[PDB]
Amino acid sequence: AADSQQVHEEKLLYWNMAVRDFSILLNLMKVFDSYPVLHVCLKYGRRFVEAFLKQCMPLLDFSFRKHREDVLSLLQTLQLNTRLLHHLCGHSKIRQDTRLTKHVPLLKKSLELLVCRVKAMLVLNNCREAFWLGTLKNRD
């Protein structure tokens, strides 16, 4: 349960590194154009952020005490995935009418949840070792 938890965190680590890879892609893609490109991020994010709360968050607290280095690193990849989703909500092409407004609120509401789940994780005995090895092992 504890030793198998390490292998599940390493997947959730660069699966997040993946969503943040995509998010940025379409934001440099929407630069020279798109209607639907923003649409993909909007809806999938809603299902991604939904997957975080109900699956990966309970596991974070699960293994949080045994392995801090894998847990604090996973919370850093979550923060960067969220920074993109925020810059995505308020957005250039979202300043265009209709279709993009039926999305933003459902992401906003569940993100103010996920974000506030990280806050309480951020304050437990903050120590730079948890952050340090959750950095250089977050490298690539």
From Swiss-Prot:
Modification Phosphoserine, positions: 4
TM region positions: none
Modification after translation, per record: Deubiquitinated by USP1 as cells enter G2/M, or once DNA repair is completed. Monoubiquitination requires the joint intervention of the FANC core complex, including FANCA, FANCB, FANCC, FANCE, FANCF, FANCG, and FANCM, and proteins involved in cell cycle checkpoints and DNA repair, including RPA1, ATR, CHEK1 and BRCA1, and is mediated by FANCL/PHF9. Monoubiquitination prevents DNA release from the FANCI-FANCD2 complex.
Entry's localization field: Nucleus
Effect of gene knockout: Mice display delayed pre- and postnatal development, defects in germ-cell development, and increase incidence of microphthalmia and tumors of epithelial cell origin.
Family: Belongs to the Fanconi anemia protein FANCD2 family.
UniProt subunit comment: Homodimer; cannot be ubiquitinated and does not bind DNA. Part of a FANCI-FANCD2 heterodimeric complex that binds and scans dsDNA for DNA damage. Interacts directly with FANCE and FANCI. Interacts with USP1 and MEN1. The ubiquitinated form specifically interacts with BRCA1 and BLM. Both the nonubiquitinated and the monoubiquitinated forms interact with BRCA2; this interaction is mediated by phosphorylated FANCG and the complex also includes XCCR3. The ubiquitinated form specifically interacts with MTMR15/FAN1 (via UBZ-type zinc finger), leading to recruit MTMR15/FAN1 to sites of DNA damage.
Function as written in the Swiss-Prot or TrEMBL entry: Required for maintenance of chromosomal stability. Promotes accurate and efficient pairing of homologs during meiosis. Involved in the repair of DNA double-strand breaks, both by homologous recombination and single-strand annealing. The FANCI-FANCD2 complex binds and scans double-stranded DNA (dsDNA) for DNA damage; this complex stalls at DNA junctions between double-stranded DNA and single-stranded DNA. May participate in S phase and G2 phase checkpoint activation upon DNA damage.
Protein name, UniProt field: Fanconi anemia group D2 protein homolog
Gene name in the database record: Fancd2
Residue range from the parent sequence: 1252 to 1391 of 1450
